[PDB]
């Protein structure tokens, strides 16, 4: 309903296992006296700031961590107090996704990142290396196929390669440095130059977007794409004989995809902060709690070590984690908006030609302000 | 709000199927008949003259936007939208009825997306969307 002292109200997006989360609220209600209402309102991540301290928010909100930094800056999130021994149960790198001004402000739940997706019928062994991809495309083009198609319009999709040799968004101990912006170092330039030589040498096309690349891979026309777990469901339906694996290296260095951590925050205006902590620790963030959620809709890879090791028996899950651990935590600061717009323009202009990779990156370096 | 402007531009595109920036009466009648309605050319022309401040025979997006802004009882319109989905009048929108209308409109959804739209709308978990559930989603904005 509205927030009431002695009950919990939870917000989580419609695509997650909210009926699985409601089962965990039921068990919590069985054990304690405490009722739990799991809700999935539309646009909850937009409504939370409008409504947070008027009593019509939730005690608990699940979202991608990168929105929580803005929330924390507006004073909407309680500071979280998990003991050192609770924190050990989760992979250490996930705790770095839920800090703001050094303070913990959410519980990590699940982890997502881009991976290399490949057609095992067209390419039984995936390339370990970005550099070996052009040759592959020569071989596949001679069979009427192509090596690789992924979305070239969104910096989120091309950033794994631009970052591999030394690029980054803002330099990370436990706070971000909005001065130190790594889009113009030699690494970023070498990464984007390779991407651009791919297009120049006609191994990829600058206009390819999400829809174009998904259709191609799911019809068996290209041997690889780059995508996240959200995309597996359409690939299953396609019945393409596909694998999911670690991203190709570049100049011997791992591709560095952005990491997104589904996290649970506690409303700073809540009179149920202790019950919320109790519900999240040792009900949700447990093998059986994350399982009830996963059985409703799959979480992908999880922050909780013990249950990830079970889920990672699926090698697509193992691959998502392995790419996450090699990746860059998406900054949760609001200057990310300037970074996004800056780098979207640089890539489209550089890839569209008539724009020096060196020039576009210099201007993108500036436009983060 | 600019987020809502974009949402309305998408709604504009449903009618402007050739994407020339204008809505004709032919484009209007194509969508309404896709929804099982039976308008005359006169009712089609009237619907467009009401919005077309230019006098040319078409609605452009500024005209469309000005009109969307202009309110008191959207309840009727939402009820009318419910009734179009609920073609057998049994009080519940099923996956089949959702798919029926979306395919009539040219909206591409996989079976899983249809099922997922049903699930999220389906507050009480009976597997179908009743009127209050429909209203909950339609009024989020």
């Amino acid at each position: 309903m509205k927030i009431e002292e002695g009950k919990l109200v939870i917000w989580i997006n419609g695509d997650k296992g909210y009926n699985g989360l409601a089962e965990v609220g039921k068990k919590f209600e069985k054990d304690t006296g405490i009722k739990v209402t799991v809700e999935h309102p539309d646009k909850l991540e937009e409504k939370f700031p409008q409504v947070a301290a008027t009593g019509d928010g939730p005690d608990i909100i699940f979202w991608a961590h990168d929105r929580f930094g803005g929330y924390a800056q507006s004073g909407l999130l309680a500071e979280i107090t998990p003991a050192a021994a609770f924190q050990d149960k989760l992979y250490p790198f996930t705790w770095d996704a839920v800090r703001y001004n050094g303070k913990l402000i959410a519980y990590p739940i699940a982890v997502e990142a881009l991976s290399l997706i490949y057609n095992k019928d067209l390419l039984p062994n995936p390339p370990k290396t970005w550099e070996e991809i052009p040759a592959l495309d020569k071989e596949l083009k001679a069979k009427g196929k192509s090596a690789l198609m992924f979305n070239l319009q969104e910096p989120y999709f091309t950033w794994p390669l631009i970052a591999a040799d030394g690029g980054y968004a803002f330099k990370y101990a436990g706070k971000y440095d909005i001065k130190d912006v790594g889009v113009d170092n030699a690494g970023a330039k070498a990464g984007l130059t390779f991407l651009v030589d791919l297009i120049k040498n006609k191994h990829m096309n600058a206009d390819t977007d999400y829809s174009i690349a998904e259709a191609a891979f799911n019809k068996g026309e290209t041997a690889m794409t780059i995508n996240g777990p959200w995309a597996w469901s359409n690939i299953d339906t396609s019945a393409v004989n596909y694998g999911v694996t670690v991203l190709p290296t570049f100049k011997g260095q791992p591709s560095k995809p952005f990491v997104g951590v589904l996290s649970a925050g506690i409303n700073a205006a809540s009179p149920n902060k202790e019950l919320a902590k109790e519900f999240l620790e040792n009900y949700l963030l447990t093998d059986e709690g994350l399982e009830a959620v996963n059985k409703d809709k799959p979480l992908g890879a999880v922050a909780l070590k013990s249950y990830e090791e079970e889920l990672a028996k699926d090698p697509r899950i193992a691959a998502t984690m392995e790419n996450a651990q090699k990746g860059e935590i998406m900054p949760n600061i609001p200057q990310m908006s300037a970074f996004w717009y800056a780098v979207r323009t640089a890539v489209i202009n550089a890839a569209s030609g008539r724009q020096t990779v060196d020039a576009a990156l210099a201007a993108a370096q500036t436009n983060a302000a | 709000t600019e987020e809502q402007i974009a949402e309305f531009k998408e709604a504009f595109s449903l009618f402007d199927k050739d994407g020339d920036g204008t809505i004709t009466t032919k484009e209007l009648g194509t969508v309404m008949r896709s929804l099982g309605q039976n308008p005359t050319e006169a009712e089609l022309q009237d619907m467009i003259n009401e919005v077309d401040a230019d006098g040319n025979g078409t609605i452009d997006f500024p005209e469309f936007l000005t009109m969307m802004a202009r309110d008191t009882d959207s309840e009727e319109e939402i009820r009318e939208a419910f009734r179009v989905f609920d073609k057998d009048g049994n009080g519940f929108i099923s996956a089949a009825e959702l798919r029926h209308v979306m395919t009539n409109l040219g909206e591409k959804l996989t079976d899983e997306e249809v099922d997922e739209m049903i699930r999220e709308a389906d507050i009480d978990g009976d597997g179908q969307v009743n009127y209050e559930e429909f209203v909950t989603m339609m009024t989020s904005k």
Partner: peptide, 29 residues
Amino acid sequence: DENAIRAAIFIQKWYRRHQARREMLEHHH
């Protein structure tokens, strides 16, 4: 009135929200 156009826009909202939601989960458009 413009009852029928508004009703049709309302009918389409279900698809707009699902589409916008899907794009954000797939990190694009």
